[PDB]
Amino acid sequence: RKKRPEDFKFGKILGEGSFSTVVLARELATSREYAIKILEKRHIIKENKVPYVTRERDVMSRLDHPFFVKLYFTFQDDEKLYFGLSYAKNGELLKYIRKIGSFDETCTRFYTAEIVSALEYLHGKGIIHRDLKPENILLNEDMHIQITDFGTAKVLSSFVGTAQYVSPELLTEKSACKSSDLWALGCIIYQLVAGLPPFRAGNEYLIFQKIIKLEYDFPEKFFPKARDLVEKLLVLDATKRLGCEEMEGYGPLKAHPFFESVTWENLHQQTPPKLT
Numbered sequence: 298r299k300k301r302p303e304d305f306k307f308g309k310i311l312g313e314g315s316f317s318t319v320v321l322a323r324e325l326a327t328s329r330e331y332a333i334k335i336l337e338k339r340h341i342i343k344e345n346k347v348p349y350v351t352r353e354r355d356v357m358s359r360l361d362h363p364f365f366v367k368l369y370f371t372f373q374d375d376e377k378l379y380f381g382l383s384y385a386k387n388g389e390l391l392k393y394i395r396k397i398g399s400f401d402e403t404c405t406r407f408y409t410a411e412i413v414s415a416l417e418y419l420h421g422k423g424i425i426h427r428d429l430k431p432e433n434i435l436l437n438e439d440m441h442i443q444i445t446d447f448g449t450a451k452v453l454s455s456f457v458g459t460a461q462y463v464s465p466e467l468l469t470e471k472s473a474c475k476s477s478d479l480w481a482l483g484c485i486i487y488q489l490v491a492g493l494p495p496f497r498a499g500n501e502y503l504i505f506q507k508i509i510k511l512e513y514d515f516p517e518k519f520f521p522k523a524r525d526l527v528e529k530l531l532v533l534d535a536t537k538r539l540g541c542e543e544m545e546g547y548g549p550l551k552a553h554p555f556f557e558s559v560t561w562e563n564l565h566q567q568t569p570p571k572l573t
């Protein structure tokens with residue numbers, strides 16, 4: 298039953314990294330399109346990433362939700378590992394933010410709700426993403442979200458993500474929790490409304506300085522209820538963020554006035570609002 302590289306017609310490179318390359322492929326027997334993540338075994342071993350790649354596959358194997366990438370199959374030849382992932386036709390959320398400038402209230406609410414629902418599922422399995430950002434949140438043909446890149450995920454019973462979305466506790470205690478993803482969520486909501494992430498500076502050190510000082514400003518147009526939500530997620534104390542266990546979880550987060558009109562139970566059945 299195991300698949301081979303010969304079973305596929307590979308196409309364009311979708312993304313390139315230091316440890317992997319994601320290529321679009323059409324399976325010959327089925328005509329199905331997959332995003333195949335290809336990882337060179339020598340380079341993984343040389344840079345000591347075996348625990349990272351192993352955990353990545355293990356985390357993706359446990360994912361069974363429409364708002365997350367699916368691992369359909371794995372195989373290997375002499376040089377490379379292949380992970381067969383779901384293909385998200387419409388690409389990164391980041392593309393759409395830069396294209397339309399900034400989302401309106403209807404679109405901000407719907408896509409934020411999808412991210413919250415995704416995170417609720419994810420954190421309910423005791424998994425932290427640790428690198429949540431618009432480029433890691435993809436969009437399928439139906440324009441629903443698909444969160445990918447679990448190469449730096451943490452399974453709860455050491456890394457530092459992307460600078461602009463890094464939480465203060467990671468800069469202070471080197472520790473990561475579920476609340477770290479929720480901080481990232483707050484940056485993402487801000488970015489959807491404002492067009493740019495909240496903490497911006499000339500270099501990483503200067504960005505990290507702004508994070509620990511909570512040095513950011515809202516534009517005047519910023520949706521009042523969206524602002525209130527962001528202010529309750531961008532909190533230096535990870536214990537005081539909406540959604541976290543110490544704040545009694547996802548109930549209160551989902552009950553926030555910004556989500557008033559949201560039907561939480563069937564988001565992926567709903568038709569997404571058009572991005573204008």
Ligand SMILES: COc1cc2ncc3c(N)nc(-c4cncc(OC[C@H](N)Cc5ccccc5)c4)cc3c2cc1OC
Nearest residue numbers: 311312313314317318319332382383384385386388445446
């Ligand atoms: C139409 O366009 C696209 C469609 C797509 N469909 C499915 C995907 C999938 N299941 N996983 C990834 C994915 C999986 N590990 C990591 C990752 O990124 C991490 C970094 N940012 C940069 C990077 C990108 C690729 C490989 C290594 C590093 C992305 C990407 C895609 C994907 C990407 C597309 O365009 C960017």
